[PDB]
């Protein structure tokens, strides 16, 4: 009657923020085989489901998300296990008697060295052709890593091509997707929806420029953890993607040297053709419209009438000062001083960048591991969409005058924050009690 009674309810729409173990999904594309193990991954539902939670307002937070911290390690653990059964090149740390490449600042070295054959007696006087950045002299040269860490050559049957990974949550959990067209990753979300799996994001690991990502809606989106703090990177997302074309015009040769029983190191043979360096092209017309479109969104945070300047990287390492990424199998390191050479106030071919290549790349954020990128045969040429920008701000003491922006970002989590800004993990608790004038039997 007037005295209500407790009544248990099962299957109530109640959730709280939590963290758990997310799993994968990767379509059913026919195939083979790559680094990011799309193999033992669960296929994607052919007809995905998305339920728009009407009237629901939820507070998201892209900077304190766990999917980013979880995907960051999954990719590292993916690259780790993929290199485990592959060749180890400890016999390659031998004195390299090098010389300039055959041409007419060399950027290449024709190095000869002794090498262990299949037998444990006679040696092998075989030559190779390593890049300038993968070899350092000593008073003759040596592989750059040898004083720092051991090396492991990637098997040439695995592919470095990123294919989409769908992150999902197990039973009892759900992932929420904020679907408003103007959202800076933090704060309450007006229009929210639930999904079991995120959309297919490709684990592209780039720097300065963010490639093959998703596009923002309407206006270009700007996201930062603390705009007033110049020690935090500012992630940018484009509405219209700029076209970028990279190529390595060097028809290389793959010399298959045999080291010991079974193992086989792949060297660089004689180059067929001209000695042309790698580069990337960006249309001057599109980049002039995109940079002017981002600075219009920057004035909404630093006064309406202010001056914004762009400059290249200052202090930094190699894999951060240069637009570092993978394009066809080789690892390019492109000079971005031609893209951030601008100065905007309050109100016809392409742009080429001198790219350099490394075969010995070091593990990001760890002490003693480096891998050998096997040489690719053929003139490499990839086409990509630059859809984002990792930018930093120089903390000038004379503030509120003119602000300068410089790129960077040698941390993979920013490459994952760029596509996990619209997702967060919650746990469903279906046990809910409620009062009503309902009593059971005697």
């Amino acid at each position, epitope marked *: 009657a007037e005295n209500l009674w407790v009544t248990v309810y099962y299957g109530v729409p109640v959730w709280k923020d939590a963290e758990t173990t997310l799993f994968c999904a990767s379509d059913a594309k026919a195939y083979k085989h790559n680094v990011w193990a799309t193999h033992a991954c669960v296929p994607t539902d052919p007809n995905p489901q998305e339920i728009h939670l009407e009237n629901v307002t939820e507070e998201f937070n892209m900077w304190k998300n766990n999917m980013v911290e979880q995907m960051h390690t999954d990719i590292i653990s993916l690259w780790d296990q993929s290199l485990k059964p592959c060749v180890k090149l400890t016999p390659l740390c031998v004195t390299l008697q090098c010389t300039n490449v055959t041409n*007419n600042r060399g950027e290449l070295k024709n190095c000869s060295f002794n090498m262990t054959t299949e037998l444990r007696d006679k040696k092998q006087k075989v030559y190779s052709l390593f890049y300038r950045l993968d070899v350092v002299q000593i008073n003759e040269y040596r592989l750059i890593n040898c004083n720092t860490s051991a090396i492991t050559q990637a098997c040439p049957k695995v592919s470095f091509e990123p294919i989409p990974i769908h992150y999902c949550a197990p039973a009892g959990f759900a992932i929420l997707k904020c679907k408003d067209k103007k959202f800076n990753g933090t704060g309450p979300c007006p229009s929210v929806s639930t999904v079991q799996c995120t959309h297919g994001i490709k684990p592209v690991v780039s720097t300065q420029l963010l490639l093959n990502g998703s596009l923002a809606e309407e206006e270009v989106m700007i996201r930062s953890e603390n705009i007033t703090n110049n020690a935090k990177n500012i992630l940018v997302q484009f509405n219209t993607p700029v076209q970028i074309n990279c190529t390595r015009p060097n*028809n290389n040769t793959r010399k298959s040297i045999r080291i010991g029983p079974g193992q086989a190191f792949y060297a660089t043979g004689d180059i067929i053709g001209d*000695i042309r360096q790698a580069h990337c092209n960006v249309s001057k017309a599109t980049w002039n419209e995109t940079l002017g479109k981002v600075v219009k969104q920057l004035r909404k945070h630093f006064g309406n009438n202010t001056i914004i300047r762009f400059a290249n990287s200052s202090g930094g390492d190699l894999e951060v000062t240069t637009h570092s990424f993978n394009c066809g199998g080789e690892f390019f390191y492109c000079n971005t001083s031609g893209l951030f050479n601008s100065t905007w106030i309050s109100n016809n071919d392409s742009i080429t960048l001198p790219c350099r290549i490394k075969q010995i790349i070091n593990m990001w954020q760890r002490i003693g591991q480096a891998m050998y990128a096997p040489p690719i045969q053929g003139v490499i040429r990839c086409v990509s969409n630059i859809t984002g920008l990792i930018l930093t701000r120089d903390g000038g003491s004379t503030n509120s005058t003119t602000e300068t922006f410089r790129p960077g970002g040698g941390d993979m989590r920013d490459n994952w924050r760029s596509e996990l800004y619209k997702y967060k993990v919650v746990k469903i608790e279906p046990l809910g009690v409620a009062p009503t004038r309902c009593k059971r039997r005697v």
Partner: antibody
């Protein structure tokens, strides 16, 4: 028409200095490039070096420290010098105009090209014998 | 080196080493007792006064020697043929390649 004529001594003692002259008729010595070519008997021709105004002059790396070219704009003729001659310098020295070219293979901006030359209008040629 | 071709046929002449990069081969013809003349500059580009019967191998092939093709062979073409190799991988050649004399038979 362009008529080039070489004229020199034709006989130079060993360890001396050769002095040749290419009398130009048909065009100016300033608005064109000039090159000298020698050829021993029964051998292939050998390039000696090109000469042009504004100090654009290069020498043969094998004959660098001995040859000295010049252009006489007031007299409209090409000159040549060769100090310290030996028996291997006995050849037929020619005089020819030179037209430059630019062969592009890369991306132009990265200096991925090279400048090639070719002589189109030769001369009648002079004969120079080295003996004591 | 001597190569002979029956009159009216097509002639082939090899000069210089094998190509290491993009080339711009210059061909010359030396009449016996006369001065050498320019035949084909820039691999396969003929100036004014040279018929289309002469064609050189393109300098876009990587791994082949400089080939000089002479269609419709006549007794007047019996002379020496030298080449000037301009290679992007090799330094400037100040000595012409060893020539090849064309012999008109019949």
């Amino acid at each position: 028409q362009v008529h080039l004529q070489e004229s020199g001594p034709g006989l130079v003692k060993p360890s001396e200095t050769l002095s040749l002259t290419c009398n130009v008729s048909g065009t100016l010595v300033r608005d064109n490039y000039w090159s000298w070519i020698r050829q021993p008997l029964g051998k292939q021709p050998e390039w000696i070096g090109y000469v042009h105004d504004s100090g654009d002059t290069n020498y043969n790396p094998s004959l660098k420290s001995r040859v000295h070219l010049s252009l006489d704009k007031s007299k409209n003729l090409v000159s040549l010098r060769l100090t310290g001659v030996t028996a291997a310098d006995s050849a037929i020295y020619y005089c020819a105009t030179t037209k430059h070219g630019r062969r592009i293979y890369g991306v132009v901006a990265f200096k991925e090209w090279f400048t090639y030359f070719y002589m189109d209008v030769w001369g009648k040629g002079t004969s120079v014998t080295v003996s004591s | 080196t001597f190569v002979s071709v029956a009159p009216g046929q097509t002639a082939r002449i090899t000069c210089g080493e094998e190509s290491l990069g993009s080339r711009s081969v210059i061909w010359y013809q030396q009449r016996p007792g006369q001065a050498p003349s320019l035949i084909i500059y820039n691999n396969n580009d003929r100036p004014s006064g040279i018929p289309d019967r002469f064609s050189g191998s393109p300098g876009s092939t990587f791994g082949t020697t400089a080939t000089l093709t002479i269609t419709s062979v006549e007794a007047g073409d019996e002379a020496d043929y030298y080449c000037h190799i301009w290679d992007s991988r090799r330094p400037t050649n100040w000595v012409f390649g060893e020539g090849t004399t064309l012999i008109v038979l019949s």
